[PDB]
């Protein structure tokens, strides 16, 4: 449930139609600490076990308290671990529809690896979604150099990492809402456009 490892273990005589990357917050355990797995219930609800794989950023993504400070608010280790999966998700999988997400240093994460990959790749994620987006100030809501339509941040009133601030408090832990509800329907909404569109041509 907390880790889940289904592209690294995975083989390309099994590819599902949507692989899912995402980034866990600092301090929280396995690869997807507490809001991972709900996403991961509500994609795997729609497409079933076997139509999406799941895939937390763990390995040099040690999810440190002090990377937060970094200016892109993470290390190039971790973005390295991300864009490994963004890669590994392209070769095994070619024709697999992307999604990513992440939560706090893991949305920083997800953002500077979705920037930094391949562009072949960044057209293939359809959508990202971002919870207690540790840059939001800085990258004034957007991930830089993809669509803000594919782009979605969840931002509570109150949680002051959104509005530039180094400072947890209490509104920053509480996505649960989010992370089970319009976060998985906006992936959804865009893997099934981006999967259509395939399927026409």
Same mark, same amino acid.
């Given at each position: 449930s907390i880790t889940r490892n289904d592209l690294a273990n995975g083989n390309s005589g099994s590819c599902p139609g949507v692989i899912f990357i995402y980034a866990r917050g600092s301090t929280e355990s396995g690869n997807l600490g507490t809001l991972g797995p709900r996403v991961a219930s509500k994609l795997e609800a729609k497409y079933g076990k076997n139509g999406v794989w799941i895939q937390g950023v763990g390995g040099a993504y040690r999810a440190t308290l $002090? #990377?937060?400070?970094?200016?892109?608010?993470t290390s190039?280790?971790?973005?390295?671990?991300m864009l490994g999966h963004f890669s590994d998700a392209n070769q095994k999988c070619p024709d697999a529809v992307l999604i990513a997400g992440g939560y706090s240093q893991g949305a920083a994460l997800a953002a500077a690896s979705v920037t930094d990959v391949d562009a072949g790749i960044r057209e293939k994620i359809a959508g990202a979604v971002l919870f207690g987006y540790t840059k939001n100030l800085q990258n004034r809501g957007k991930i830089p150099s993809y669509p803000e339509d594919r782009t979605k941040v969840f931002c509570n009133t $109150? #949680?002051?990492?959104?509005?530039?601030?180094?400072?947890?408090a209490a509104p920053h832990l509480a996505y649960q809402s989010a992370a089970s509800g319009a976060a998985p329907e906006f992936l959804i909404q865009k893997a099934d456009a981006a999967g259509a569109a395939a399927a026409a041509l």
């Amino acid at each position: 449930s907390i880790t889940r490892n289904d592209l690294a273990n995975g083989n390309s005589g099994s590819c599902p139609g949507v692989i899912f990357i995402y980034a866990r917050g600092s301090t929280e355990s396995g690869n997807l600490g507490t809001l991972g797995p709900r996403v991961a219930s509500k994609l795997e609800a729609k497409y079933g076990k076997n139509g999406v794989w799941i895939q937390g950023v763990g390995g040099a993504y040690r999810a440190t308290l $002090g #990377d937060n400070a970094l200016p892109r608010g993470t290390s190039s280790a971790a973005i390295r671990e991300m864009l490994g999966h963004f890669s590994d998700a392209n070769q095994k999988c070619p024709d697999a529809v992307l999604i990513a997400g992440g939560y706090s240093q893991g949305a920083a994460l997800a953002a500077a690896s979705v920037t930094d990959v391949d562009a072949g790749i960044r057209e293939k994620i359809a959508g990202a979604v971002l919870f207690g987006y540790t840059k939001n100030l800085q990258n004034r809501g957007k991930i830089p150099s993809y669509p803000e339509d594919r782009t979605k941040v969840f931002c509570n009133t $109150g #949680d002051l990492v959104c509005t530039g601030s180094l400072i947890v408090a209490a509104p920053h832990l509480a996505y649960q809402s989010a992370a089970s509800g319009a976060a998985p329907e906006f992936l959804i909404q865009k893997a099934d456009a981006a999967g259509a569109a395939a399927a026409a041509l």
